[PDB]
C-alpha cells in the first residue's frame, strides 16, 4: 500500500520501509525488514551494511545488529514485492529484535530511541531512518485496584477507616478515571480536606502529579463518607513540566503521555492513583493502574 522511503544524499542508497511503528509484543517483537537499492557502479566498497541500533540518548547503545545486504552471505512477503517493483539492484535486510529491550520513550524538554541505518563500507553513503518501539494495552483487565488503611492516634480510641478503589486497571489515554473514596471517622479530629491524584513513576527517579483533584469536603467526628471522583490525565495541563515521560515520537509530532511498561534497561514507566485525607496527621492510600493505547480492531 505505502512504503516510506528516504534517498541517500547521493541518491544511490534509497531505504524503503513498510512501517515505522514496531510493536513490542510481550513474548516477541515485530521484525524490522526493508530493502536497500544500490547502483553497482556507485558501489565501490562492494559491501553495504544495514544496522538496527537502540540508543539511550541524554550516548549509550543497548542493541546493535549488523546484516550484510550485499554481497549475499529469507524475505518477508513485502520485501519480495518491493524488490520486484524496484528491479534487481535492490537487496533486502531484516532484523529480529529480542525481548527484554526497552520501548521508545522521551523526556519532555533524550530517552530510548531506535534507528535503522545503511552505509557502504568495505555522509553520502549513510542513510538513517528513525523508527519507534511501542506497545499496546493488555487485552484483558486485571483485578480491581482496592486499597484500605486504618490510621489511629493516641488521643482517639477508635479507628479512622479510610478506603479507596478504582473501577478497573486498564485506562487508555484520554479516559476519565473514577476514584471511589470512602471514609469512616470515629475519631475526634476534623477531616479538613480530601485530595485525589494520578501520578507517574518513571525510573531511568521522579514523581510528577499528572492529574489532581482537591475537594474541601469535611467529615465531622463520628460520621461516614462516600464519594465518587473523576480525573482525566492528559497533556493539556502538562506542558511546563520538564522531565515528563512522553511516548516516543518520530520527528517532532506531539505525542501522548508515556504508556505503561508491560513486563531490563531503559526507562520503566507506571501510574498510580493516590487518595489522601488532610486531617486537623494526613492519611494516604495508593493503587496501581495501566495507562496505554488500545489495539485497533
Amino acid at each position: 500500500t505505502r512504503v516510506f522511503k528516504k534517498a541517500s544524499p547521493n541518491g544511490k542508497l534509497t531505504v524503503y520501509l513498510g512501517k515505522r511503528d514496531f510493536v513490542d509484543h510481550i513474548d516477541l517483537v515485530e521484525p524490522v525488514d526493508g530493502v536497500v537499492l544500490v547502483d553497482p557502479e556507485y558501489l565501490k566498497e562492494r559491501r553495504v551494511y544495514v544496522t538496527l541500533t537502540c540508543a539511550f540518548r541524554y550516548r549509550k547503545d543497548l542493541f546493535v545488529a549488523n546484516v550484510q545486504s550485499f554481497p549475499p552471505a529469507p524475505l518477508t512477503r513485502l520485501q519480495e514485492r518491493l524488490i520486484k517493483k524496484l528491479g534487481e539492484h535492490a537487496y533486502p535486510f531484516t532484523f529480529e529484535i529480542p525481548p527484554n529491550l526497552p520501548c521508545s520513550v522521551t523526556l519532555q524538554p533524550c530517552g530510548v530511541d531506535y534507528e535503522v541505518k545503511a552505509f557502504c563500507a568495505e555522509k553520502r553513503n549513510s542513510v538513517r531512518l528513525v523508527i519507534r518501539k511501542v506497545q499496546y494495552a493488555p487485552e484483558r483487565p486485571g483485578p480491581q485496584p482496592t486499597a484500605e488503611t486504618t490510621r489511629q492516634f493516641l488521643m482517639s480510641d477508635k479507628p479512622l477507616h479510610l478506603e479507596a478503589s478504582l473501577d478497573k486497571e486498564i485506562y487508555y489515554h484520554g479516559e476519565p478515571i473514577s476514584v471511589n473514596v470512602h471514609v469512616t471517622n470515629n475519631t475526634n479530629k476534623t477531616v479538613k480536606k480530601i485530595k485525589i491524584s494520578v501520578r507517574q513513576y518513571a525510573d531511568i527517579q521522579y514523581k510528577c502529579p499528572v492529574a489532581m483533584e482537591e475537594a474541601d469536603d469535611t467529615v465531622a467526628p463520628s460520621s461516614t463518607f462516600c464519594k465518587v471522583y473523576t480525573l482525566t490525565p492528559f497533556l493539556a495541563n502538562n506542558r511546563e513540566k520538564r522531565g515528563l515521560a512522553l511516548d516516543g515520537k518520530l520527528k517532532h509530532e506531539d505525542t501522548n503521555l508515556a504508556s505503561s511498561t508491560l513486563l531490563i534497561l531503559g526507562i520503566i514507566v507506571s501510574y498510580k492513583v493516590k487518595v489522601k485525607l488532610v486531617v486537623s496527621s494526613d492519611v494516604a492510600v495508593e493503587l496501581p493502574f495501566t495507562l496505554m493505547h488500545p489495539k485497533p480492531k
Partner: antibody
Amino acid sequence: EVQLVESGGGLVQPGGSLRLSCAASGFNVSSSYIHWVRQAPGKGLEWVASISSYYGYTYYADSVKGRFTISADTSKNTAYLQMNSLRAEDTAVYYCARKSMYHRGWGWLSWVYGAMDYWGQGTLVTVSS
Amino acid sequence: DIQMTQSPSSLSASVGDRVTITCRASQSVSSAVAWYQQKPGKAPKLLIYSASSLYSGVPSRFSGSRSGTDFTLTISSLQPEDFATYYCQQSYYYPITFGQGTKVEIKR
C-alpha cells in the same frame, strides 16, 4: 455507536449571547477534534471553530475570532461554544462534528485535522431586535 | 486562507448521466480534500476523504480522484437520491474552507 447532540439555539437580540452545547456519546472528547460549523439561510457550509481537549488546542475562523469561544468538559464529556456579541449575520443553523484522532495504527494523529465523519442534527440560531 | 474554487456552480442531469464535479485548491493541498453531500435542510454527509478514500456506507458509484490541486468527484450513474448540493473541503490547513456547493438539478 457514536452520537453528538446539539442544544442551545433560540432567538437573541443583537449584541446578546448564547451558549451551544455538544454532548458526545460512544467516544471520548479527549481522543478527538470537535468542530463547530454553520450554514446561513440560502448559503453554503462554513466552518466556525475547532478544539482538541487532550492537547488544549483552539482555532476559530476570522469571522468569529473574539466573539466566540470554545471549551470542553471531559467530566461530562461535552463541548461548549460561547457565542458573544451576536449579530444578524450570525443567524444560521449550527452543526457539531467530530474527527477521531484514532486510526493511525498505534496512537494519535495530532496533525491530520481530517474529515468530519460524524455530524449532529443542527440547531437554528436567530439574531434580531 | 486557501480558496477552494468549485465548478460547475450548478448542473442539470438525468438518471444515468455520468456526472462529474471539480474542486481546485488555491494552494498545494496534499490529498486532504473531503467531499460532502447536503440535502435540503438536513445535515452534511461525508462521502469522500483524503481526496481518494471512500467512506463506509457510501455507495460505490461515488468516486474521488486527484491530479494535483485539481480534485474530482465523479458519479458513475446518477440516481434520484443523488440530487443535492455537493461540497468540497480542505482539511489540511486552518481555517477549514469549503467550496461553494453544486446543486445537481434535473433536466427537462
